[PDB]
XYZ file of C-alpha atoms in Angstrom:
188
model
C 300.865 143.299 170.502
C 303.698 143.294 167.893
C 301.900 140.627 165.743
C 298.210 141.112 165.487
C 295.320 139.287 163.885
C 294.250 141.375 160.863
C 297.466 143.061 160.448
C 300.477 140.815 159.348
C 298.103 137.799 159.075
C 294.478 136.987 159.250
C 292.777 134.035 160.994
C 290.605 131.543 159.089
C 286.970 131.595 160.438
C 286.891 128.065 159.262
C 290.240 126.199 159.990
C 291.357 123.392 157.809
C 292.265 120.186 159.675
C 295.340 118.088 158.677
C 296.526 120.832 156.372
C 300.277 121.172 155.446
C 302.281 123.077 157.893
C 303.384 125.898 155.610
C 301.172 125.992 152.394
C 301.890 128.373 149.518
C 299.674 129.093 146.520
C 300.803 130.644 143.255
C 300.223 130.970 139.517
C 302.677 131.423 136.698
C 300.160 134.167 135.441
C 300.441 135.992 138.812
C 302.522 139.184 138.614
C 303.196 139.423 142.319
C 303.996 135.702 142.388
C 306.788 136.470 139.753
C 308.110 139.085 142.124
C 307.854 136.618 145.199
C 309.840 134.019 143.297
C 312.474 135.918 141.261
C 313.024 139.255 143.066
C 312.138 138.463 146.669
C 312.868 134.723 146.964
C 310.115 134.483 149.666
C 309.788 130.671 149.679
C 313.539 130.535 150.154
C 313.775 132.923 153.044
C 310.858 131.430 154.865
C 312.672 128.065 154.773
C 315.729 129.653 156.070
C 313.858 130.682 159.242
C 311.465 127.754 159.824
C 311.993 125.476 162.786
C 313.427 121.958 162.242
C 310.797 119.455 161.208
C 308.642 121.832 159.268
C 307.676 120.991 155.695
C 306.859 123.481 152.952
C 304.276 122.917 150.318
C 303.730 124.975 147.192
C 300.769 124.556 144.889
C 299.733 126.024 141.565
C 296.174 127.205 141.029
C 293.643 127.152 138.075
C 291.766 130.344 138.409
C 294.191 132.383 136.305
C 294.837 132.094 132.609
C 291.983 129.877 131.738
C 292.904 126.802 129.689
C 296.701 127.348 130.044
C 296.176 127.981 133.665
C 295.012 124.264 134.094
C 297.834 122.988 131.954
C 300.302 124.802 134.270
C 298.696 123.148 137.275
C 299.208 119.751 135.686
C 302.814 120.672 134.744
C 303.537 121.761 138.253
C 302.177 118.321 139.318
C 304.690 116.820 136.843
C 307.358 119.003 138.263
C 306.541 117.848 141.814
C 306.371 114.100 140.875
C 309.735 114.410 139.094
C 311.362 116.590 141.685
C 312.354 119.243 139.221
C 310.573 122.406 140.768
C 313.926 124.141 141.101
C 314.622 123.744 137.381
C 311.453 124.795 135.668
C 310.054 127.477 138.069
C 312.159 130.289 136.598
C 311.798 129.327 132.840
C 308.009 128.872 133.381
C 307.680 132.390 134.947
C 309.675 134.012 132.276
C 308.031 132.103 129.396
C 304.624 133.210 130.586
C 305.338 136.855 131.811
C 308.718 137.919 130.441
C 309.089 136.584 126.948
C 305.586 135.365 126.497
C 306.683 132.291 124.645
C 304.411 129.949 126.492
C 301.089 129.825 124.734
C 300.165 126.102 124.685
C 300.843 122.859 126.539
C 303.477 122.049 123.998
C 305.371 125.298 124.879
C 305.195 124.350 128.554
C 306.651 120.885 127.545
C 309.563 122.635 125.761
C 310.481 124.416 128.946
C 310.996 120.921 130.527
C 312.834 119.482 127.573
C 315.280 122.427 127.715
C 315.697 121.892 131.372
C 316.801 118.429 130.566
C 313.802 116.207 131.422
C 313.435 113.532 128.754
C 310.460 113.852 126.557
C 309.309 110.245 127.218
C 309.712 110.889 130.976
C 307.741 114.033 130.782
C 304.865 112.551 128.675
C 304.693 109.490 130.939
C 304.446 111.701 134.024
C 301.942 114.068 132.395
C 299.642 111.238 131.672
C 300.171 109.302 134.937
C 297.522 108.915 137.637
C 300.119 109.795 140.187
C 299.941 113.239 138.531
C 296.177 113.190 138.320
C 296.046 112.774 142.091
C 298.783 115.413 142.608
C 296.602 117.675 140.533
C 293.548 116.755 142.790
C 295.711 117.673 145.919
C 296.480 121.103 144.463
C 292.781 121.749 143.760
C 291.645 120.354 147.106
C 293.972 122.472 149.103
C 292.902 125.689 147.263
C 289.274 124.618 147.681
C 289.601 124.037 151.488
C 290.813 127.614 152.133
C 288.667 130.140 150.129
C 291.178 130.736 147.574
C 290.570 133.511 145.082
C 293.791 135.335 145.233
C 297.599 134.601 144.900
C 300.235 134.759 146.010
C 298.877 133.291 149.292
C 300.444 131.522 152.144
C 298.695 129.627 154.948
C 300.232 128.256 158.260
C 298.834 125.046 159.767
C 295.462 125.610 158.023
C 294.627 128.362 160.459
C 296.507 131.566 159.686
C 296.907 133.411 156.316
C 299.742 135.874 155.674
C 298.823 139.396 155.114
C 301.598 141.045 153.178
C 299.523 144.253 152.460
C 300.052 144.906 156.156
C 303.974 145.246 155.936
C 306.090 148.143 154.708
C 307.418 147.727 151.097
C 309.944 150.688 150.898
C 312.690 148.181 151.323
C 312.435 144.748 149.654
C 314.883 143.046 151.967
C 313.023 144.235 155.072
C 309.735 143.118 153.533
C 310.994 139.620 153.066
C 312.374 139.297 156.610
C 309.182 140.631 158.043
C 307.291 138.153 155.999
C 309.527 135.206 156.992
C 309.506 136.125 160.710
C 305.711 136.303 160.594
C 305.678 132.732 159.181
C 308.061 131.681 161.978
C 305.845 133.426 164.627
C 302.751 131.774 163.269
C 304.594 128.490 163.078
C 305.389 128.588 166.859
C 301.826 129.556 167.701
């Protein structure tokens, strides 16, 4: 076939019921994730090709960067609760991997302050049990699906994207092949 199990995607031996339709995992410590977000704009190009009705979920993971890794998962929870993903994603990536100015929870906080979220609003979210459960959700989703590597994308809790099986000579072509694969899996 043109799309084949084990080539552009793999199948989960143990499907995850009730899972989000398109589910993406990343880490601000993850070098390919930096690429996926700032150079390739994967999440975005997947959206542009998804059917109508399909929601996209993106979660942070704990297994990179130890203690700060966990802080970042909580901050991503804050970002999701406040609806400011599109304002902190880039400064967080660059603060961790480009400038290396993010070294503590306080530095993570500075990124939000500079993006214009008010301190009181950030600290209140940070400490909220809405954010605790949003952290819980991120962890549970990663736990449900084997997850020991990022970037990762899952479609309907049953298929997992396999970017190693796509040509990377051309970045634009890689992205489209990726997005089309998601759309194919989506319609499956």
